[PDB]
C-alpha cells in the first residue's frame, strides 16, 4: 500500500514535489512509474525510476521538466516538476511495480496527490447543514445534507458520523463557479433514526487544514 | 511516438452479458527476437486508482476474476468480459509499453438496467448561511435510471433558469442509479422577496412532473 503526498495549490510558473512511500516493502525491489490525469481526461504517463541504481525515464513531453529521485533510506520515491503551468493541474498517481518477484508481476498504485496550479488563493469552505422542511418525517424514510461552499482548491472529504453512516449516502462532484468551489452531500436514514438519533457530517479540506463537524439539528 | 485508439467510447450493456471493446495501436507492439506483445489493459473505477488487469496482451494478472480475457497480436487487440457485473462499471484503457509508454483514449463502460423514479428532497436555506447574508436552496433527486432528467426550478410561479448549480454523481456500483443535486444560489434579499420555491422534475420514468416546493413563511 502506497501513501502519498497531500493535494497541493502551486502558482503558475512554481515548481512542485510529490512524494510517494511505503512500509510495506522495500522500494528498492520496484520500478516507480508516475501517472497523471487532468479533469474529464484520460491517463498520461510520465517516467519511470529505478530505485535500485537512480536509472531514470521520461516520456518527450516531460523531458527536462521532470526530475525524479529516491530516498531508499526512509522508503520514499519523489517526482519534481518545474516550471508548472495550468495545464499541468491534474491527480497524480504513482505505481510501484515489480516482475523479479513472483510467477506474477506486482502492481501497487497510491491513492493519487490532487495538485492544482493557479494563482488563486486557497479558501476554505462554509459547511452548512441541511435539515428538511416541516414537511418531511410524515415518511418512513428521511434525507438530510451537507452543503460545503466556496472552497478552493479541490478536494475535499465527507464523512457522516465518522463513517458509521455509508449506506444512503450520495457525495456530488463539485462545481466550479466563480473561481470557487461548492459541494453537497446527502445522506437519507429512517425517519425513526433521526432526529431521534444524532446525525452529524464531517469535512476536511486538505489544502487549508480545516477540519469542520457540522451537527444536523431540525428546524 | 505510438497512438493508441479504442472503440466503442463507451456502450451499456446489462448484467450478465458478454462485452468486447478494442485497441488499436499505429505500430505493431510484437518484439520480433521475443515473440511478446508489449500491451496491458487497465481498470479504473470511479474516485479509485487505475489498476492492472492484464499485461503481455494475454496474461492476467493474479487476483483478477477469469471473466476478463485478453487476446491479440501485433496492432490488434481486444479486452472481453464474460458475464458483466454491476461492480465492473469503470473506464478501460490500453496501454502500450514497447516505445515509452502510452495510453488508449479508453472505453467507458455503463450498466442498463430497469427504469427507476428519483427521490426528490428540496431544502431552505441554512439559519446559519442567512446570518451571513447568502441563500442557497437544495434540491436532491436521488436513485433514478436512466440517466437523462430535467430539473427546473420555480420562485412564486417564475421560473429561474440562471444562477443553478447542477451536478451528477458517476453512476452506482451496486444498484447502478445515478443521484444528482441541484443548487440555486440566492442573496439574502432576493431570498426573503419571495414566499414559493419549487424544484421540479421531468423523467421518462413518469408522464408527470415531480415537484417539491415549501414556503419560507413556515418555521
Known amino acids: 500500500q502506497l501513501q502519498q503526498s497531500g493535494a497541493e495549490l502551486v502558482r503558475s510558473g512554481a515548481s512542485v514535489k510529490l512524494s510517494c512511500a511505503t512500509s510495506?516493502?522495500?522500494?528498492?525491489?520496484?520500478?516507480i512509474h508516475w501517472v497523471r490525469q487532468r479533469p474529464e481526461q484520460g491517463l498520461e504517463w510520465i517516467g519511470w525510476?529505478?530505485?535500485?541504481?537512480?536509472?531514470?525515464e521520461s516520456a518527450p513531453k516531460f523531458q527536462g521538466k521532470a526530475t525524479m529521485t529516491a530516498d531508499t533510506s526512509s522508503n520514499t520515491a519523489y517526482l519534481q516538476l518545474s516550471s508548472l503551468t495550468s495545464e499541468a493541474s491534474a491527480v497524480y498517481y504513482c505505481?510501484?511495480?515489480?516482475?523479479?518477484?513472483?510467477?506474477?508481476?506486482?502492481?501497487?498504485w497510491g491513492q493519487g496527490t490532487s495538485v492544482t496550479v493557479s494563482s488563486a488563493k486557497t479558501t476554505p469552505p462554509s459547511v452548512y447543514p441541511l435539515a428538511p422542511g416541516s414537511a418531511a418525517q410524515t415518511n418512513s424514510m428521511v434525507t438530510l445534507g451537507c452543503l460545503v461552499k466556496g472552497y478552493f482548491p479541490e478536494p475535499v472529504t465527507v464523512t457522516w458520523n465518522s463513517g458509521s453512516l455509508s449506506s444512503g449516502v450520495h457525495t456530488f462532484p463539485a462545481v466550479l463557479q466563480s473561481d470557487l468551489y461548492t459541494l453537497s452531500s446527502s445522506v437519507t436514514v429512517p425517519s425513526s433514526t433521526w432526529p431521534s438519533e444524532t446525525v452529524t457530517c464531517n469535512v476536511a479540506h486538505p489544502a487549508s487544514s480545516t477540519k469542520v463537524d457540522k451537527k444536523i439539528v431540525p428546524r | 511516438d505510438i497512438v493508441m485508439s479504442q472503440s466503442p467510447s463507451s456502450l451499456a450493456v446489462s448484467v450478465g452479458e458478454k462485452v468486447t471493446m478494442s485497441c488499436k495501436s499505429s505500430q505493431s507492439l510484437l518484439y520480433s527476437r521475443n515473440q511478446m506483445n508489449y500491451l496491458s489493459w487497465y481498470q479504473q473505477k470511479p474516485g479509485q486508482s487505475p489498476k492492472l488487469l492484464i499485461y503481455w496482451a494475454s496474461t492476467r494478472e493474479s487476483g483478477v476474476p477469469d471473466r476478463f480475457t485478453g487476446s491479440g497480436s501485433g496492432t490488434d487487440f481486444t479486452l472481453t468480459i464474460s458475464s458483466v457485473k454491476a461492480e465492473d462499471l469503470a473506464v478501460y484503457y490500453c496501454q502500450q509499453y514497447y516505445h515509452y509508454r502510452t495510453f488508449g483514449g479508453g472505453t467507458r463502460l455503463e450498466i442498463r438496467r430497469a427504469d427507476a423514479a428519483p427521490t426528490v428532497s428540496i431544502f431552505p436555506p441554512s439559519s446559519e448561511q442567512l446570518t451571513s447574508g447568502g441563500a442557497s436552496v437544495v434540491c436532491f433527486l436521488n436513485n433514478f435510471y436512466p440517466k437523462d432528467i430535467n430539473v427546473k426550478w420555480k420562485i412564486d410561479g417564475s421560473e429561474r433558469q440562471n444562477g443553478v448549480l447542477n451536478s451528477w454523481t458517476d453512476q452506482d456500483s451496486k444498484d447502478s442509479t445515478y443521484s444528482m443535486s441541484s443548487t440555486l444560489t440566492l442573496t439574502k434579499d432576493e431570498y426573503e422577496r419571495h414566499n414559493s420555491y419549487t424544484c421540479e422534475a421531468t423523467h421518462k420514468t413518469s408522464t408527470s412532473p415531480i415537484v417539491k416546493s415549501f414556503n419560507r413563511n413556515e418555521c
Open positions: 525510476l529505478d530505485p535500485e541504481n537512480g536509472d531514470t
Open positions: 505505481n510501484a511495480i515489480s516482475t523479479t518477484r513472483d510467477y506474477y508481476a506486482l502492481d501497487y
Open positions: 510495506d516493502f522495500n522500494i528498492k525491489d520496484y520500478y
